[PDB]
Amino acid sequence: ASLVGKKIVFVTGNAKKLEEVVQILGDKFTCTLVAQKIDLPEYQGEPDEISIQKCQEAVRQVQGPVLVEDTCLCFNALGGLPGPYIKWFLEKLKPEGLHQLLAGFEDKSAYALCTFALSTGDPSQPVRLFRGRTSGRIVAPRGCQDFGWDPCFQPDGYEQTYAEMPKAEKNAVSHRFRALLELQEYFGS
Amino acid sequence: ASLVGKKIVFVTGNAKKLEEVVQILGDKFTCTLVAQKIDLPEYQGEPDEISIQKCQEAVRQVQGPVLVEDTCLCFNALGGLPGPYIKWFLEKLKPEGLHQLLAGFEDKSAYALCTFALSTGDPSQPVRLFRGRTSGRIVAPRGCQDFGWDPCFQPDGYEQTYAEMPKAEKNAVSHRFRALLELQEYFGS
Secondary structure: OOOOOOEEEEEOOOHHHHHHHHHHHOOOOOOEEEEEOOOOOOEOOOHHHHHHHHHHHHHHHHOOOEEEEEEEEEEHHHOOEEEOOHHHHHHHHHHHHHHHOOOOOOOOEEEEEEEEEEEOOOOOOOOEEEEEEEEEEEOOOOOOOOOOOHHHEEEOOOOOOOOOOOHHHHHHHOHHHHHHHHHHHHOOO | OOOOOOEEEEEOOOHHHHHHHHHHHOOOOOOEEEEEOOOOOOEOOOHHHHHHHHHHHHHHHHOOOEEEEEEEEEEHHHOOEEEOOHHHHHHHHHHHHHHHOOOOOOOOEEEEEEEEEEEOOOOOOOOEEEEEEEEEEEOOOOOOOOOOOHHHEEEOOOOOOOOOOOHHHHHHHOHHHHHHHHHHHHOOO
C-alpha cells in the first residue's frame, strides 16, 4: 500500500484481455498494469481458495504487485459444480453436453462467476478478492459456438444466451464486468 | 537409483494406508517406507499430469525418495470426468447424485483409477507412474454409504457394488491393488 506509481503485473497471454481491463478500470489513476505471461499451476479447491493460491504463487515469482483472474460456471443442481473445473467439462462435453449433464435435475439454474485476485507483493499483506456474479439458466445451446460455454448460459432477465447476445448487452449483465466494477470501488485505497 | 537401503517417504495421514501398502508390496526387500504427512497442493490437469506435479512438489520439500497416490472415478459418458475431481462431486452430489449425473446418457460405463507416483528424489530423474484400473458401471447406490463413492460403482464381472463387496473380493478387482501390483513388478530395478 499503495500501488500508485508501481507497475502491477496482470497475468494474461492476451493483450486485448489486458486492454479490456485497462479501459474498463477507467483513467483513475497511476496504478500501472503490464501483461506478463506467467505459468501458474491450476489448483483444485473452492473458487476463493484457488484465486488466493494462484495469486500467492504469482507473488513468489513476481515479488511485486500482481493481478490474476479466474472464471467458474456453477450449476446450482450440482452445488456450484463444474465451477472452477468448467474448462475440462466444456472440452469433454461441449455446450450440448453441459446442458445434457443436468438432464436428471429439474433445477437448471446456474451462475457465472468471475474472480480477480490482487496482491501488493508483500506476503504479510493478504490477497484481496474482487468478484462478479451473474445468475441464469443452463439451456440447450444457442448462438455462435466458438464462444466457450456462452451458448448454454441464458442470464436471468433475458431471452438470449451469452453467445446470442450482442456484446454491448452482454457487458451490462457480465460476471466479468461486475468483478471489474468492484476493482475500481476499491481503487484509491 | 537405487533406493535400496534408502528411506522412501510415502505421503499419507493414514498409518493403515501405509501399512496396507507395506504388506501388499511384499517382503522384497530393503526399500524402507515411512509415512509423512505433507501438505501438497491439489492440481487440475489430466490424471498423469496431476500425479507428476504432485510428486515433483513432494520432491522439492522432501529432497529424497517420495511416493504419492491419487484416485479418480471416470465416467465414460463424460469423457473420463469427474476423474480427478471426484472428491468434490461426491461431497456435493452424494452417491445418489453421482448416478443422477448420468441420467441424460445411455452409457453408464465407468472406470476407477489409482495412480502411484514415485521419484528417487533426484530431479534430473523422471517421476515413474504406476496405475491400476477397474472397469465397471455407475449404478443407483447399494451398500454402506460411509465408503466414499463405492456404493455407486459396480465392477464388471460382479453383481455387487464396491460397497456391497466383502473386502476380500474387492481386493481382487481393485484399482488400488492393480496399481500396487505394478509397483512390485518394477521393484528390484
